[PDB]
Design a protein around this ligand. Structure first.
Ligand SMILES: CCCCCn1ccc2c(C(=O)Nc3nnnn3C)ccnc21
Ligand SMILES: CCCCCn1ccc2c(C(=O)Nc3nnnn3C)ccnc21
Ligand SMILES: [Co+2]
Ligand SMILES: [Co+2]
Lengths: 381, 381
């Protein structure tokens, strides 16, 4: 059941912004590791004396990497005279975020019809304001409310290229990397208490709970009207045999924050081949592969969706498979993206639910907790 | 003239340590961009609850990348009970360094006969102490004194593998990259006033001035007894037509600090081919190439050292050439390594001065200031 209760018109995920200590080095690492092209910049070379921001794109996926310069470069400025291209940016907030959480997501940005009204309606419905609506060059409006921890939900709306003040990088520095990633499927938060987080966020968005179907967590998924904006949230479950991975996150992250980004690939096998080629030469590492018994058991579960060859291709690459009542989900998780065991990335591809493909086709892999523990001791054999 | 006045026995450059906000991402970027292998780690997986430190090596060159974890992970510890593998590390110092300077070099480490005596003699001769000698697992002694800005000169000495507490990374994660870089040739500091910096450092080391031979700088080189440890220092010259690059550094770095690291390659042409292949896919960019007239003029200057083919190979790669009375220097500079126009890297190869090759053979490229401005307007033509 989908009551379509969005309190304002939401379009799609627009971008994800990482707050960094050095944006250059994170952005170059991510570009190579994920096959994302450098497509826009806002920094000293564009007149920005406040922050360095670099945009990577792959298909519709937009990753933004931002770090502060010395406050001394902009000490003469005031907000009316700012050279920052993202007016919500604040040196103190950014340094405090990074020193508290390390590398991580500051903003989950979604495109809306009207960022001003989305902000007003949100705050009228319980949202904690973070940065009021600001119109940039009479062309783009940006506003932010608190989502969880120090993560903001950023609204962006266009009258009618990323943001004003951002320049198109030179072609020479813009190598057309592409490993098949195409869009952000969902963005997941970890919190100490799921109930209040859900009540808060569903309260000010009107997002509805997306229907699904002891591993140390409970979770739920909030979704927009067409269920293309998907915001799952986890809480830990205490007292389990193995310590909850959610609690470990909260400890190392110093509280709530974004846990993982799920990136849809138009060809997950090519994406994983390309990413795994680069794991040891600057890219990303992947979780340990499931035992061969997990893949033996794939025949009974998805033998009507994937061929034996395509199943063997899953086994080569360590891909996991789960199935809804409506679709099939292929997924795999990276190891943490940085020093701390906090944020990581999921690569996914969904099969089924054609009408375009509807959102969340195949679910989020809930069945892979059980099946993996069913593969752990079956493989002990 | 070399008075050989070292006040303690110095061996070679041992390592360079970068203080980072996220060590993982900088280290992976540097590994790919420079062709350096992951060779040791000290982090959560090795019992270090304080800092994450990753060591890259290429030949004898050792780059260490270190970032702090949340202080909460080690809040119960005291220095006697610390899990840090580098006991001079301090969360507050590291966060303050990175927030003040951005990504940069915290420690220039040299190997000495006896780090305890080097520290004592240094402090007895004016050195400002930074971290007293500490013996690690009865095997390695480490001590630090202030060099300039927030950069320390680190002494390390071995009774008899990087440091105790560091583990040899797994082979799977240790891809044997190598683009031909083999050792650190020299490490250069920028300061507001050259005279006092020289007096201070030469004062406590006994290092002597290395004999050389309006561009906005004056400089001088301090050298150890066999002139294998080379520490040049720049100061700005004010009032010039083009604003001094040293002054721009001081402004963006918030004061003195390490300006560049010169890395000797055993085959600079292969190093530059390999680094330039990767500039736009995660590696390092290089300064704009000199005009073809600069390379036309190379025949008269070094036509007896380099063939026409080897000169054309310099032209393809943007390499600069200078000559001493004793040797020839091939060199090239990267663009800044991170967000700020502060630290960069020089790749060099020296030809001549065989006895082994003596230190500083060919100088440091002083003649390339004049020759480049002689190439700028000659090429205007
Ligand atoms: C040991 C490897 C497989 C672990 C089992 N496993 C299955 C899914 C899954 C997610 C995830 O993706 N969760 C999510 N995504 N959207 N909503 N939710 C709740 C995060 C961490 N481990 C997961
Ligand atoms: C526009 C491209 C060529 C610039 C001319 N150019 C020649 C050398 C050089 C150094 C350097 O390497 N300096 C040094 N190294 N050791 N000691 N010193 C003083 C640093 C910056 N620009 C330099
Ligand atoms: Co997920
Ligand atoms: Co140099």
């Amino acid at each position: 059941k989908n009551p379509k209760s969005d309190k304002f018109k939401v379009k799609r995920f627009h971008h994800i912004e990482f707050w960094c200590g050095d944006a250059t080095n994170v952005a170059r690492r991510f570009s190579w590791g994920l096959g994302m092209r450098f497509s826009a910049k806002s920094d000293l070379s564009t007149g920005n004396m406040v922050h360095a921001s670099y945009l990577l794109t792959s298909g519709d996926l937009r990753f933004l990497f931002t770090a502060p310069y010395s406050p001394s470069l902009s000490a003469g400025e005031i907000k009316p005279t700012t050279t920052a291209s993202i007016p919500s940016f604040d040196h103190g907030s950014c340094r405090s975020f990074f020193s508290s959480h390390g590398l991580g997501v500051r903003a989950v940005a979604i495109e809306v019809e009207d960022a001003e009204s989305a902000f007003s309606i949100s705050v009228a419905n319980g949202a904690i304001p973070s940065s009021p609506p600001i119109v940039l060059n009479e062309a783009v409006t940006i506003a932010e409310v608190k989502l969880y921890g120090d993560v903001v939900l950023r609204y962006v709306s266009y009258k009618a290229e990323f943001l004003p003040g951002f320049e198109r990088v030179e072609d020479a520095s813009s190598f057309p990397l592409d490993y098949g990633i195409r869009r952000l499927d969902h963005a997941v938060g970890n919190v100490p208490e799921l109930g209040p987080a859900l009540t808060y966020v569903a309260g000010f968005t009107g997002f509805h709970q997306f229907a699904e179907f002891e591993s140390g967590l409970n979770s739920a998924v909030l979704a927009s009207n067409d269920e293309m904006v998907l915001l799952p949230i986890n809480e830990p479950v205490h007292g389990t045999k193995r310590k909850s991975q959610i609690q470990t996150y909260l400890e190392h992250n110093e509280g709530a924050g974004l846990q993982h980004l799920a990136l849809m690939s138009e060809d997950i096998f090519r994406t994983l081949r390309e990413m795994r080629k680069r794991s040891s030469i600057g890219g990303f590492d992947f979780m340990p592969s499931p035992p061969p018994t997990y893949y033996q058991n794939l025949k009974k579960r998805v033998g009507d969706v994937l061929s034996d060859d395509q199943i063997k291709e899953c086994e080569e690459l360590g891909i996991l498979v789960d199935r809804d009542d409506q679709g099939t989900l292929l997924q795999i998780f990276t190891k943490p993206l940085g020093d701390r065991p906090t944020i990581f990335i999921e690569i996914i591809q969904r099969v089924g639910c054609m009408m375009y493909q509807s959102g969340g086709c195949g679910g989020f892999g809930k069945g892979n907790f059980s099946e993996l523990f069913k593969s752990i001791e079956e493989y002990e054999k």
